[PDB]
């Protein structure tokens, strides 16, 4: 049947080849008459879980649960979890749209809402990961240094030992990462097993209370300790929000699995479930460990065997005394340790202490490895789009699975430098702010997509309410402020600067962002609003349709039309295409884009309006009948003077004059512009009341900065002995309209016979098109029907001598008075259709406008365009 | 010449008679073939000066100067003058645009920025003036009560005497106001003369030092007092902002002259200059009096001759002794005189004593008279505007000059009630905030008019910078908050409530406000923005041109098309008008308004688009070639099934089919809707790949609240023995597009001969259109060019039997399967142009769709409309 059935091969044209077996027929033919890929578990779940988990489970979780209450600590965890889950829901929604080629969160953000935000967030996120690797390596070095300092071993000052260990660790991590994407997965699995072993060791040792640890804070699940550990016992210059700020970074790292989207077996399924499961499991483990530590250890303790453990005569109505006096009465002296003074509680409540030490080692190393892997991927994805041209390179992949070795080396260098600094406690909040900004950008991506009701939003993952996403972005910003407000300001400024730079760069890319859909929707909504507004005389605007063909053919005329339309009124540059329909469609499709881009590149607020018809008359008919939307429709027809009418087929001149006639018939106002295309005052000779357009146009000219210094001087026609009366009337009328005029000149020389020379010149010019009916018999009635109506009938030439003499005399007056004007505006002669031939009308116009400064012959609708009523 | 020269009579038609000869010729006729008025001084200057001056020049200015030094008091006056001068500049700008028919600031505000704000501000301002009448009368009563209590002539308490005196004065003022406008002006002049006499008396007395007043603070213009008082004191619980709030109401009252616009000889010349002169003179007098009082009286004093006045040896480091010791050394014991404890200081520092009291009487009475005059004016103007229908009563005018007698009575009643309350100290801030809100609305009117760039702005008064006006409105809001913050919140709430009520009432009025111009400018700017956005498959929208004629003939089809276009994509209702051009233009002009209003009233976000042409074919050509603006152009022709084609001239059917053909030639998509107009699943039978529109339309259908429950079930064609493979392929394709489907059905019964009965029925239906070439001879070729291309040839009928049987069998299948669907979407058969006659195409469509639920035959553009990439 030649009509192809729906087939995936038809739509598959970017990630594969359709081939000969799949090719949808075009409408014309029917019409025209004749590599490593990971699963969701090992690719998203494990990476997300390992990135989320860190030293908080073994260092600060006990301190947080002590400073705050069990209930308040659980609340802090839950609120951080809200912020991360909302972010994860938004990420899954943005990832279940189409095929994600690679990159990571940068790819999702860019393909969602445009290269500007995409590049800003991509650079920020890549830098954040490149510095996070160094921070995690520094944490590992700190843990190793503390472990060796607890013994006698040491090489150099603590800082230098930290630097050495960090450098060795970073070198090893870079080697492992360069080894490949499978070795890294094996190492991640090993580290996860070790960390789970450490967690289980802590939980097992919390169930075995050894008396030797009694002088410590550990007691072994005593309900009295639990009841005493509620409430916010803040023993410092800190508060609830300080604890929240300290803990929240422990909820981050939820985008690790989506950072390697270019290596997943199948995104759109692995990312959502993997990320959500990782968030759930990590939050559950955090809550469990918080409660466990809060039900075993007392806040304060003075570890000492000599400490009274016999519970002699006393009351000391605290939780500790409820079972024994061990680690009691340090409310005045700074007792050694406890749930609020020792950060190794997890290492003591546990069993095998080196098991917990290895758990911390794995927690830091897994995060470092994940960051080192993820940052180069984002950088290479952002570089492959050439958003920052200098960053070209750092995008070449090596081996079967394209791996950014150059990005790997760059991340290694950045991490090594930041480790060489070795003092990173002041930079962590900036990195946290960067991550929070990325989360907020993802949430805003989802919200923007839901706001712009693009039919192609079509996300495969539900449970992504737009309002929840907006609330999540707001919460991300608020949490960003809650910790290191000045860091938040710095990140905001950096993001805004990058966004502005990218917007000004205007990169050559087009992805289908929600920004374009929202632009269309905004235009549609505003047009629909405007369609319900009644038109008023004082709200009239010149809405011009300029017949120019190619808008670049005559630039002076286009600029002039722009002057009195730019920012006030509509401007449609109409172009008529002629020839066969087939090639005409392709030519119009090319020209539309070419000329719209040309206009936008020259600051012309005009609309290109191509049209295909047999002749210019029919195309202009199309435009004057249909061009426009609702109330934004042309009311004025603008033409340029047919400067070549003298040497041109009379059919073209007839078409020009017929354009005039159809413009008048359709109740349009006609503006004919005659100026020298090759490349003071404004004189307005408006002698017939067209409704005011002749005055409105030059006033709008004066409203612009190009004609601000030009003063309007008016010319009118009067009767001798009555000059002053008419001048006063014109001055009063102009004052009522509030149009400033430098001078008013009343001329009685109109209606007088022009000179003999000018009449002779007009006759000589008009001779070739004269019919000369008198010199011929009735046979001439065939020329008037075949070689006509171009021919000028002697009857009309004698019946309209007044108008011809008026045109010649008016040209004389214009030359004598307005020769020094910057622009002339004059009433456009109107010829009744059927009474005057096209050739005679063209000759009238040519005689009127010949050899003068830029001139505009204006004939308005005759509907009132000005008013003096408020 | 029948062309009329410019003349004021053509444009003078709304506020004056046009006349016989005052009628410009219409473009068709030339182209078609064939009592008491006041001047600016007595009307604006005097009223503004008398309203601005209150009891602050004799009661509170001295206390203010005492509380804050000379410099700080001068600063307060200057800042209040900034707020008022900005307001006055905006008022002059808004009043020098057109002829101000009547009313006051209400008329200017309404004619500037729309009936909503106009009515809100008018009601609030009228109420403010009415209440101010009572407040000024209460001030007069208080002054008289104090004067008579100084001599113990009070009767029936004090408040109960204030009530009686105020009632008598209000009755007298009402009588004077009813007496006419000239008598009020004479009384105003008399009061002004008295007040100037009082001011001059104070200034003269300040130069006549008298030892009698030595016990009082007055000393005689001594420098030492000036240096002492040049600095702030701010005694008691007083602050700079508190004194500024106390003083600022003194600067108000600048709109008294503009409130009399309906009785001025020449507004646009009297209001601006008069108001500015009033502001200047009042501020100058205020500054002079403040400085003079600060240079002649000490802040503290104790008036007694027995007190120490010798100035003998005494340390008294304070500067009060610089000239004498009279009225000194009460820094601990409260004093009874001075610039901080006595308010009658002016009366004491003057010459004749009762003349100051007379000046106070005049100041308090002139403001009351002005308010009682102005409030009815504004109320009558806003009532003649008929913005609140219940208030149409208070619009009648009496006498030669329309005088709102009912408004006068209502204002008198309101003032009498508020005087009967007699305790207005708590209501003054409300009135001040109302006045400030009016000032802010005037400034925002000027700013909004400058924002929208309508050519009709054209204000005759310069010096009105838009940013200055916006700053003035902001300052007015801030000042109104500064004093009585809760009063400011209450006034804001009242203004917003009135604005919402007026917006929802939708009054039937059109004045060409700045809001409409801004709507147009916003739409144009958004369209210009959208014109620069590149096109992407992800952002494709269905932009439909529905050929419906009158948009109310078939409501069901319009609803159906609007369901999948509202909020997503454009919708243009195209109507073609035939007949003579002259009458056609008027018909289209009326129809455009009628149908746009009908659409907006019916909640259709569509655009009515009428064209004039001699046949539907070329009108649709106009629409498909030119309709739209920039990137908001249609790409899908929507047609209703010709249900009468069986009984209708075959020229109409040929035009319909050629509409199809031209739609395809212009590479448009085509949607044909067949549904019953007189009186839950969506079945998509898309069998040919059109690019995806057949699938994209029903999805958008399911995207709306009216089709949320319906589930999409798909039907495709397949080969027997491989049904499951094709079903899996279709399921995968739909999942990649993210279009939810309840079921997929693969049909092998296509391309099979339908029932004999159905073929016989099709033949019977098609019988009276066959060319019967075999039965006839070569002469039949004439019918192919005279009765054709309607006639169905025998060659085509025999050569396209497969397609006809396909249509019949497809209708059988749809009746068998989709008979219970809420809507059906099917692939529209495409007939090669020149190969199939129009009648056979129509019969194909009829056979395909009949005895079915609502159906959409969709033939997409064959360009990809869906994508599974991101
Ligand atoms: C890079 C960076 C910057 C700022 C804060 C964090 N913290 C995070 C982040 C994600 N998951 C857990 C944590 S954590 O709870 O602090 N555990 C942890 O081992 N942090 C190490 C840096 C010592 C990480
Ligand atoms: C109706 C009203 C409400 C609130 C404040 C004012 N004050 C104004 C207004 C205009 N010019 C001067 C003043 S004034 O300086 O306060 N003098 C004065 O006599 N006010 C009298 C009410 C006693 C007026
Ligand atoms: Cl992350
Ligand atoms: Cl006022
Ligand atoms: Na980790
Ligand atoms: Na007054």
PDB file of C-alpha atoms and ligand atoms in Angstrom, chain A residues 51-56 132 135-136 139 247 249-253 286 428-429 431-432, ligand 1:
ATOM      1  CA  UNK A  51      28.520   7.794  48.664  1.00  0.00           C
ATOM      2  CA  UNK A  52      25.773   8.601  51.179  1.00  0.00           C
ATOM      3  CA  UNK A  53      27.564   6.828  54.031  1.00  0.00           C
ATOM      4  CA  UNK A  54      30.645   8.393  55.586  1.00  0.00           C
ATOM      5  CA  UNK A  55      32.447   9.022  58.873  1.00  0.00           C
ATOM      6  CA  UNK A  56      29.214  10.341  60.403  1.00  0.00           C
ATOM      7  CA  UNK A 132      35.237  16.084  47.500  1.00  0.00           C
ATOM      8  CA  UNK A 135      38.395  16.019  51.215  1.00  0.00           C
ATOM      9  CA  UNK A 136      37.676  12.296  51.603  1.00  0.00           C
ATOM     10  CA  UNK A 139      39.706  12.355  56.136  1.00  0.00           C
ATOM     11  CA  UNK A 247      24.411  16.341  60.201  1.00  0.00           C
ATOM     12  CA  UNK A 249      25.832  16.666  54.615  1.00  0.00           C
ATOM     13  CA  UNK A 250      25.510  13.052  55.760  1.00  0.00           C
ATOM     14  CA  UNK A 251      22.264  12.823  53.760  1.00  0.00           C
ATOM     15  CA  UNK A 252      23.889  13.987  50.503  1.00  0.00           C
ATOM     16  CA  UNK A 253      25.634  11.815  47.921  1.00  0.00           C
ATOM     17  CA  UNK A 286      21.143   6.199  60.516  1.00  0.00           C
ATOM     18  CA  UNK A 428      33.648  21.796  53.261  1.00  0.00           C
ATOM     19  CA  UNK A 429      30.661  24.184  53.618  1.00  0.00           C
ATOM     20  CA  UNK A 431      31.206  22.046  48.678  1.00  0.00           C
ATOM     21  CA  UNK A 432      28.014  21.303  50.606  1.00  0.00           C
TER      22      UNK A 432
HETATM   23  C1  LIG C   1      32.965  16.157  50.315  1.00  0.00           C
HETATM   24  C2  LIG C   1      32.147  16.638  51.476  1.00  0.00           C
HETATM   25  C3  LIG C   1      32.043  17.995  51.738  1.00  0.00           C
HETATM   26  C4  LIG C   1      31.285  18.435  52.810  1.00  0.00           C
HETATM   27  C5  LIG C   1      30.629  17.516  53.617  1.00  0.00           C
HETATM   28  C6  LIG C   1      30.733  16.159  53.352  1.00  0.00           C
HETATM   29  N1  LIG C   1      30.044  15.230  54.209  1.00  0.00           N
HETATM   30  C7  LIG C   1      29.360  14.056  53.724  1.00  0.00           C
HETATM   31  C8  LIG C   1      28.885  13.968  52.428  1.00  0.00           C
HETATM   32  C9  LIG C   1      28.221  12.823  52.011  1.00  0.00           C
HETATM   33  N2  LIG C   1      28.032  11.809  52.859  1.00  0.00           N
HETATM   34  C10 LIG C   1      28.472  11.868  54.114  1.00  0.00           C
HETATM   35  C11 LIG C   1      29.132  12.998  54.583  1.00  0.00           C
HETATM   36  S1  LIG C   1      29.688  12.988  56.238  1.00  0.00           S
HETATM   37  O1  LIG C   1      28.589  12.671  57.091  1.00  0.00           O
HETATM   38  O2  LIG C   1      30.316  14.197  56.660  1.00  0.00           O
HETATM   39  N3  LIG C   1      30.782  11.728  56.241  1.00  0.00           N
HETATM   40  C12 LIG C   1      32.141  11.886  55.832  1.00  0.00           C
HETATM   41  O3  LIG C   1      32.881  10.926  55.807  1.00  0.00           O
HETATM   42  N4  LIG C   1      32.653  13.164  55.471  1.00  0.00           N
HETATM   43  C13 LIG C   1      34.036  13.326  55.063  1.00  0.00           C
HETATM   44  C14 LIG C   1      34.197  14.561  54.197  1.00  0.00           C
HETATM   45  C15 LIG C   1      34.934  13.387  56.286  1.00  0.00           C
HETATM   46  C16 LIG C   1      31.493  15.722  52.282  1.00  0.00           C
END
